[PDB]
């Protein structure tokens, strides 16, 4: 690893600088180096890791969708043949995206998840595992598409089970997990009723526990609750 000679603390410091500079590829590389030092990550450090890769893959997904749309139009009746270039370039972007997903899944498997014993860390990592299999699913068209989808489902489900047992219904990790698993149901698993049920129940159970929270915790929870409501509005 090119980051093998840099101090863990220096990698974290630089990830924070990269974030400030909106250099997310760099931020992700620094955080990969930090993980590979082999020590568990703090809450702040887990967030740096997730922010970095979310931004990187988020950009790849946006580009893939542009390119896939162009490709789709090229295959409509009456579209002039333009050769292999659109497919080739969509494939290039797709392969880079899959590579990023595999890198993140690799970090979670070696060895973030197995060393995470506290609910907050284990749920955080398992949510990521679900999310990155979901991104793989978005581009999957082959023999393994089912197994990729099931991999996402299984990770989300383990996260859900732990989060329900161990965290309050207003916990922002629990909320964000539910938000994303709900989207998995709607967009990946062809289960819109499940998506809607999940978002509604999650919202309502959080609403009921808001009274227990400080002003600051209330802000964090209500922000994610609004995202659940936004999805429900979109879907109904």
């Amino acid at each position: 690893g090119a980051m093998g000679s840099m101090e863990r603390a220096s990698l974290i410091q630089k990830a924070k600088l990269a974030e400030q500079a909106e250099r997310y590829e760099d931020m992700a590389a620094f955080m990969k180096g930090a993980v590979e030092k082999g020590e568990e990550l703090s809450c702040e450090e887990r967030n740096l890791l997730s922010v970095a890769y979310k931004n990187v893959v988020g950009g790849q997904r946006a580009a893939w969708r542009v390119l896939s749309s162009i490709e789709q139009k090229s295959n409509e009746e009456g579209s002039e043949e333009k050769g292999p270039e659109v497919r080739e370039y969509r494939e290039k972007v797709e392969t880079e995206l899959q590579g990023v997903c595999d890198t993140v899944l690799g970090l979670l498997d070696s060895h973030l998840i197995k060393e995470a014993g506290d609910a907050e860390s284990r749920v955080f990592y398992l949510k990521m595992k679900g999310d990155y299999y979901r991104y793989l699913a978005e581009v999957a068209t082959g023999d393994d598409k089912k197994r990729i989808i099931d991999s996402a489902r299984s990770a989300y489900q383990e996260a859900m089970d732990i989060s329900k047992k161990e965290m309050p219904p207003t916990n922002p990790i629990r909320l964000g997990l539910a938000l994303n698993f709900s989207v998995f149901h709607y967009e990946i698993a062809n289960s819109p009723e499940e998506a809607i049920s999940l978002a509604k129940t999650t919202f309502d159970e959080a609403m009921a526990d808001l009274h227990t929270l400080s002003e600051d915790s209330y802000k964090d929870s209500t922000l994610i609750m609004q995202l659940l409501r936004d999805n429900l509005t979109l879907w109904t």
Binding site: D131, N180, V183, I224, D230, L234
Partner: peptide, 5 residues
Amino acid sequence: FPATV
């Protein structure tokens, strides 16, 4: 596209 975090 729906919201995720």
